[PDB]
Amino acid sequence: IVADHVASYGVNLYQSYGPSGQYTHEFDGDEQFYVDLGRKETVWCLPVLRQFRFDPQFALTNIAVLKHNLNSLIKRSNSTAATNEVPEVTVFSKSPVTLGQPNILICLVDNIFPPVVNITWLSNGHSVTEGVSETSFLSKSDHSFFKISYLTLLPSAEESYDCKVEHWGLDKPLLKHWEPE
């Protein structure tokens, strides 16, 4: 479908594994907000959108409908389970690399299905905890997902990094290396 702008009001997701759910709104491929289903609060991704209110109860009520529909389809589809796809991982910096200037490493994990993944960062081969964040699962027209993880860093000659991706479509965790050069 061709359009000047495309929006999802919203992306509703519920899956048996967990079980887990997700509610987001998207405009032109970017996440406008998500609803924290556990805490029942709307978390705006864009500061200018904070001037609006969105009742988080809508997401909870909608996801509950998805849960009912999922149980019906599991029986009717004769327990047809999801197929694990091979995700595609790309690592790149947000800004041009300048040694000593704070930057952000971006790990794009594409072709995610089912939407269950672990995205972690390594620095000089050891796990990193501070400075890591990620988007929600972002929708694709083929109904798979992609997800983006961020790692703040100070580019230097003595630190190299890896984005570590765990997914059932991968027999081994996938490591995508990145160096400041």
Partner 1 sequence: QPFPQPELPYPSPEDFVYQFKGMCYFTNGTERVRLVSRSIYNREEIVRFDSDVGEFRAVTLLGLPAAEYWNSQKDILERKRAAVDRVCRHNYQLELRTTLQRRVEPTVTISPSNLLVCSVTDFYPAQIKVRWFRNDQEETAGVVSTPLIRNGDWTFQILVMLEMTPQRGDVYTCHVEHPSLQSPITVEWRA
Ligand X SMILES: *[C@@H]1O[C@H](CO)[C@@H](O)[C@H](O)[C@H]1NC(C)=O
Q: Which residues bind ligand X (CB under 6 A)?
A: 116-118, 166-168
CA 160 to chain centre: 24
DSSP string of 64-76? Answer: HHHHHHHHHHHHH
Taking CB under 8 A as the binding criterion, the range among 82-90, 119-127, 153-161, 172-180 that sits at the site for partner 1 is 82-90
In the complex, least distance from residue 120 CB atom to partner 1, rounded to whole angstroms: 17
Phi then psi dihedrals of residue 114, to 5 deg: -75, 165
Q: How far apart are CA 58 and CA 81, in angstroms?
A: 28
CB atoms within 10 A of CB 152: 15
Please say which residue, 85 or 134, places its beta carbon nearer to a second copy. Answer: 85
Pairing of strands 30-36, 20-27: antiparallel
User: Counting contacts by CB under 8 A, is residue 40 touching partner 1?
Assistant: no
Within residues 76-115, the interface with a second copy by CB under 8 A covers 83-86, 88
User: Counting contacts by CB under 8 A, is residue 52 touching partner 1?
Assistant: yes
In the complex, least distance from residue 113 CB atom to partner 1, rounded to whole angstroms: 6
Taking CB under 8 A as the binding criterion, the range among 75-83, 122-130, 154-162, 172-180 that sits at the site for partner 1 is 75-83
For 145, the 3-state DSSP assignment is strand
